């Protein structure tokens, strides 16, 4: 038995590894709240009238620099977003770097510069860190952990029947752009990544309809939108109907995905948030989102249903019906 590239692609195969090994071998997985078993964007720890949200994320994106961002902006964006979809405000970041022997000092400096610029946007400080250097020709790996405070934590199992499903922006910008960058595909207007912290987007909605009406969230990163939705459906044991015509997708993204032969629904997003809200607050959330710089393109894509529990039903543009299958992992165009 060998570990395959897919065992870490965030899809079904990785879920197998987590279910057949990781969660199966670890026995102590909770500190009084949401734990490892929940496989949520982060864990929670009851601490008074509050809850501490804890999360960690490894970043190994290649190349370290790409249209719209870098492994540095990504490291900060990812951890802040994972805290945010839990309903927590970023408090501090811990930064671990594993650098390959021979990296250009200018690369490390540039990455650090981006991390800092990104951190100040939240804002959130990087209070502790670690630095390792290996001979392995790896360039760089950035692992960021983060702690946040949530008055009312949100999980992937809060979705209720009748609830509406929203996304803060266009789907597939990060994943596709990075792919189009690989195959050398050029552009009229360069297709860039969307990597960016979106705490302000979540905060805005909560500050508009209240945390009590935000029943679920998740940043659709690895495996993309479909994966994030399939996760919410399973853990909430609800069904999810999505209307393909309401999913925001850039023309460049559609075009490139087609040529690449990969659905933009299965690719990672680094600047978006999926939000399941109370049916009578969807419009306010949508508008509260539209009023933010990172949420201009938000849109209600569907609703939580009672049928097809644990699955994601997709109503195609022409009116057809099919399931939005969670990808097996990393796309291959």
């Amino acid at each position: 038995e060998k570990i395959k590239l897919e065992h870490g692609a965030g899809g079904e195969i990785m879920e197998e590894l987590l279910r057949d090994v990781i969660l199966k071998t670890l026995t102590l997985k909770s500190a009084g709240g949401i734990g490892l078993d929940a496989l949520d964007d982060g864990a929670t720890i009851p601490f008074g009238d509050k809850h501490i949200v804890f999360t960690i994320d490894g970043h190994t994106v290649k190349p370290l620099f790409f249209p719209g961002g870098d492994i540095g902006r990504l490291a900060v964006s990812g951890t802040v977003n994972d805290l945010a979809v839990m309903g927590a405000e970023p408090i501090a970041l811990a930064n671990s770097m594993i650098i390959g022997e021979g990296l250009d000092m200018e690369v490390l400096k540039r990455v650090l510069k981006s991390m800092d610029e990104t951190a100040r946007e939240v804002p959130v400080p990087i209070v502790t860190g670690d630095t390792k250097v290996v001979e392995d020709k790896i360039e760089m790996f950035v692992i960021t952990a983060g702690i946040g405070i949530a008055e009312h934590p949100v999980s992937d199992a809060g979705a209720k029947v009748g609830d509406a499903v929203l996304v803060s922006g266009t789907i597939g910008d990060h994943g596709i752009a990075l792919m189009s960058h690989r195959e050398g595909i050029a552009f009229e207007t360069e297709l860039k990544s969307d990597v960016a912290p979106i705490w302000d987007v979540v905060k805005a909605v909560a500050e508009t309809i209240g945390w009590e009406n935000i029943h679920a969230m998740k940043d659709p990163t690895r495996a993309g939108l479909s994966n994030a939705l399939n996760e919410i459906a399973r853990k909430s044991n609800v069904g999810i109907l999505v209307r393909e015509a309401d999913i925001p997708i850039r023309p460049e993204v559609r075009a490139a995905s087609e040529m690449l032969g990969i659905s933009p629904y299965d690719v990672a997003n680094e600047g978006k948030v999926v939000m399941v809200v109370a049916r009578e607050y969807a419009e306010e959330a949508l508008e509260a989102m539209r009023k933010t710089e990172k949420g201009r393109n938000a849109a209600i894509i569907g609703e939580v249903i009672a049928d097809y529990r644990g699955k994601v039903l997709l109503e195609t543009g022409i009116g057809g019906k099919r399931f939005m299958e969670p990808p097996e992992g990393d796309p291959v165009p």
């Binding site: 897919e6 195969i13 015509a245 032969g261 997709l314 109503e315 195609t316 543009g317 022409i318 009116g319 057809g320 019906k321 099919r322 399931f323 939005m324 299958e325 097996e328 992992g329 291959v332």
Partner: protein, 368 residues
Amino acid sequence: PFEAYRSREVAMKLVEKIREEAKTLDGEIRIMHVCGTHEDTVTRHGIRSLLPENVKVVSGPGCPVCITPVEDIVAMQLIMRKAREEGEEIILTTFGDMYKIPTPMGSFADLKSEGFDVRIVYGIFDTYRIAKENPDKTVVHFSPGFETTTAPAAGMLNVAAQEELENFKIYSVHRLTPPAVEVLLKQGTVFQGLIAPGHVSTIIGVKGWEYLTEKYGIPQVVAGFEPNDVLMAILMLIRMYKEGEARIINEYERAVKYEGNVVAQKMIDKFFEVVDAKWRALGVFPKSGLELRKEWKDFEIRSFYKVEVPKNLPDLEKGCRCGAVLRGLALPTDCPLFGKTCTPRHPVGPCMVSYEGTCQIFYKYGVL
């Protein structure tokens, strides 16, 4: 920009006309398409969930990579080894899906594993470009594909002779669609209507498919690949069946000419010769393949090497029902391995590996 062909209203209308026509229909009408891209249209847009219980759409052998004989894949591999020993390293190009196609003796990927130079390309041009960047080596492209893919190959063979390239060879495994349909007719595959592959038609035109309706009275409909193309073609076929009509309707007239595309036709004819060829899991179909003419034998990598491919190589792994899937006689879900031991990431059969494979399309899209 052709939005109508994707229009929800346009579709809701076509779906209604279709529904109306089927309500007054006896028995069951079965329409077969022979192009994985059409199966992708049907499956991607959930068209089947919009059809009346008495109207079925089945996918035929419209996947060139799926039907490529394992004997040919093994041969190409036996020649890579035969060259490494003759001190002549070869640069092999293949399509991404073909690259991972299984055979009882391994894929082109398992080969790469052994240190060989196998490269994934998106078209024959890539191969051409590699032959000029690597003069000190022989570049060969395992070339499978239907007419739509044969043309770009023939076209590149014209630009290769003029330049007088000598390290530009290819292993021809090209196949013809029409002959496959006729073999399926003589073998009982049930269907009262055909949805001819738009792009293969773009090449051989409406004229290329006529010889079938005249010899079997089967109505055909050259169609595009937008959702309403397929919905239109289904309606147009249901009616020719109910009215007893037996002709060919070019619903893809916007991209297809009656005569087709002469340039490509001659382009292909100048280099390729129709011959009997085997179809993986299907059998040997008469005059269904294309091989290089004796004059251009210098472009066929098999004219520079003679390998002995072991006999009795099984076409499929035990339990695989890709042969029946290809005939439109079986659905991927009928297969026990489907979604279990057989997935796009770890495929057991060719139908799941290929981009146009019916099994991959069903898996990728979560059919219901």
